[PDB]
Amino acid sequence: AMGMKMIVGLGNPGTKYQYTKHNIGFMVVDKIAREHQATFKKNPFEAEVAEFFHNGEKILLVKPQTFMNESGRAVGPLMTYFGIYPEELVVIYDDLDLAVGKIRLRQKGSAGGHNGIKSIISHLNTNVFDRIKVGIGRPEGKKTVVQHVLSPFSKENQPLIEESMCQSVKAVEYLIEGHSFVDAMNRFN
Ligand code: NA
Ligand code: NA
Numbered sequence: 001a002m003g004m005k006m007i008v009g010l011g012n013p014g015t016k017y018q019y020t021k022h023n024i025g026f027m028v029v030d031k032i033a034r035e036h037q038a039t040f041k042k043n044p045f046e047a048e049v050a051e052f053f054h055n056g057e058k059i060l061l062v063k064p065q066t067f068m069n070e071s072g073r074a075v076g077p078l079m080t081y082f083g084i085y086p087e088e089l090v091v092i093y094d095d096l097d098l099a100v101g102k103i104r105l106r107q108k109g110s111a112g113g114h115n116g117i118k119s120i121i122s123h124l125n126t127n128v129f130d131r132i133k134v135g136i137g138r139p140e141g142k143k144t145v146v147q148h149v150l151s152p153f154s155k156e157n158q159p160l161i162e163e164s165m166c167q168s169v170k171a172v173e174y175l176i177e178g179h180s181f182v183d184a185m186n187r188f189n
Pocket of ligand 1: 011012014
């Protein structure tokens with residue numbers, strides 16, 4: 001297996017969570033959908049799945065609907081459903097260790113305390129897979145981590161988060177146009 005076939009954006013289902021930091025993965029793949037104008041359908045593997053085409057090939061966008069900490073429960077089986085492997089995966093999600101307005105691309109690494117990534121590592125039996133970390137900043141003021149990730153972005157940070165979602169979409173476009181992930185790392189890191 002080689003070549004990107006699936007982009008997973010992490011987050012929690014429901015209107016309550018739709019603008020919270022921990023749903024930044026949902027937001028990016030939503031943006032990627034609208035700029036491919038593509039359609040998300042409920043899927044039996046506890047996910048919303050959209051499909052679009054580039055040249056003659058299918059690219060899938062996935063929003064697990066399990067809640068964050070059980071994301072792998074959707075992603076592992078869904079990936080088996082389409083016959084795809086961790087090498088063909090890109091996961092997009094929120095990174096506390098990155099400032100709002102920044103993104104980082106990585107090929108591997110531990111969950112580092114992110115329980116959605118922990119679930120995907122568990123269900124895939126590897127921590128080697130491409131990912132786009134979208135900065136959500138360290139917890140602001142006196143908030144706990146959970147209060148921080150389960151709350152919206154501040155007015156100050158809204159233009160910065162829009163910039164980093166634009167950059168995340170540009171990185172994905174770069175991948176869809178055929179550049180390698182190493183190439184994308186050189187360009188966006
Ligand atoms: Na949501
Ligand atoms: Na890496």
